Design a protein around this ligand. Sequence first.
Ligand SMILES: Nc1ncnc2c1ncn2[C@@H]1O[C@@H](CO)[C@@H](O)[C@H]1O
Ligand SMILES: Nc1ncnc2c1ncn2[C@@H]1O[C@@H](CO)[C@@H](O)[C@H]1O
Lengths: 329, 329
Amino acid sequence: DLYFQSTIAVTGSIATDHLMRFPGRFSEQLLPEHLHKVSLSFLVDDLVMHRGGVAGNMAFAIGVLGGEVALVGAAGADFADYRDWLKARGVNCDHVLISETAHTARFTCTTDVDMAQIASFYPGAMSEARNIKLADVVSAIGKPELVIIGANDPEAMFLHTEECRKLGLAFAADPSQQLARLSGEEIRRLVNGAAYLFTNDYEWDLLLSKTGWSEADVMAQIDLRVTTLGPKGVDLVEPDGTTIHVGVVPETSQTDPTGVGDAFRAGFLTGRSAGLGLERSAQLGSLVAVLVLESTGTQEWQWDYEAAASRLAGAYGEHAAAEIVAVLA
Amino acid sequence: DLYFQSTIAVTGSIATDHLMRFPGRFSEQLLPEHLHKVSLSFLVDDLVMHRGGVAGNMAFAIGVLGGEVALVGAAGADFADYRDWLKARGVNCDHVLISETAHTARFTCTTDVDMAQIASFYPGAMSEARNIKLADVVSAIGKPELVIIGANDPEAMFLHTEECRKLGLAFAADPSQQLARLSGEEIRRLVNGAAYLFTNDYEWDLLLSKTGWSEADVMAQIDLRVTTLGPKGVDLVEPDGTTIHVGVVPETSQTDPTGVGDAFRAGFLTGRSAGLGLERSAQLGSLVAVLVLESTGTQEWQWDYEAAASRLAGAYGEHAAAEIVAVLA
Ligand SMILES: Nc1ncnc2c1ncn2[C@@H]1O[C@@H](CO)[C@@H](O)[C@H]1O
Ligand SMILES: Nc1ncnc2c1ncn2[C@@H]1O[C@@H](CO)[C@@H](O)[C@H]1O
């Protein structure tokens, strides 16, 4: 592709999140005989609304961190206010498709005492993301260094990936939130040639369960597997074997785990974009991740290059801290 | 209790239900390693709003069937319209507590291809049900023949049960939807002296799991256990052993399983109130149940004493049909 260069393009959902808390344990209610057919209803304690969508969340964090970033997804007419919120953190919202008729997607999530999460996602306007052409985005802003293919309209996820394939754009397969809806055929066609494959360990097992793939089958198709491991940090795997592991940044609170994955990805890719190695990028990712864990909502954390250095030092040593803080603003 | 007699009083929730469909299988996404901590998000196909709440649903069906019924629960100021809907089917709504400040409860439910259900319930005004005194209801309308203690504000469930205990009113323990939220101590104190204990088989196992009780411990405290069994119908158990079983009324469609339990209970109790035996009452219950299964929403079915006779005959024989249709309007 001989077109001019220029950014991270974040594709994926744009939504309003309704986050609720169940003051009990989901596992305790999940009987393994009855898992053939669940019958679950959780009386919640709390209900609160925040800006969301995987693409919204990732684009926001890249912007906070000072990265150049374009948000590419479909929203309802209601988007104008959310746009202003994103633009305030430097997010390019020019290529957001605004539906003439449909409402911005709605996420309804319940979190339990162990940070387990059970949620529904109503697409609304998201379904129109299949009508967005990345070719038009590239035309206007140049080739991005990376396109993130986040959870989105299932058809859009594939069309965007195919467009990256034919445009010769590097892409990160980040199907996370959609693995439950996507068939094994649908997951398989998103993976080949990915610079990065992002998931957590559950989703990793779900992917391999539904694809019929072994880990070896996947590593042959991708440049890097990134698998977050909850409290055990993150694994960075290479073509066949080499594995870098970074442990979490210890949390002061487990408030709300929504968007923790999105935040890690944004920090990590920002790190990678700034010439940081895999280990250092994952350490920065882990910090943004914990900042999200300690706040309610996905985009309600702050940046403060002083507190960042301090925390990174405390978890990873002062070499890590100094290396990360430097390659930034 | 030497106060004058008169009705079924239905206590439990009053809500707005948001019902969604996941065009996949929950079980297929539920990995049994990862059940320690789930991470589930379902892209849904459909979102629709209907009148709901266990008490709303049960009171509605008793009313449709021509029964005398009083609805006792807490709702928001928004209740006026829902009231008119209930009154149109003969439901006494005089003893509904209307919150000055809080919103009518919200149920958000996702149903999969196998009729499994995963849901959140936001109490809002329901929490004020703990301020309702059944003594005041009894004062105004006389002693009901039965009080149903449906899923409600957890504290209200117990206060209502205690009030039935001291007022000497027969009550049906129907904790179904709240078993997930209630502790084992909280479930245990709802059961003693119940004329009926209603659940499905999952909830039955959940109850015994969380109470630390054996089936024998429960049967010693209640007059009858009624355990619905999905496609395998319903078990009616007696103090120690005698078990009547009634199989389902074969469905023409599996549209929406929400409120199927509530409908069975309403039909069964209506049957019991009309001097029908346990078997005949469960057969009538099973019909209301299938009528709910075949419609979207909980209160969107109809009555048509001609089609009722026909269906009952087809499933249970024409003796059953004639016996049930007779003791009604
Ligand atoms: N199935 C889904 N499809 C697209 N986005 C989703 C889905 N489930 C959750 N999300 C978004 O992902 C979360 C953060 O990772 C929320 O902000 C929510 O809006
Ligand atoms: N946890 C709960 N507490 C009270 N009512 C509930 C709960 N979960 C579901 N419901 C109500 O029960 C359903 C029917 O049984 C819905 O109409 C819903 O409003």
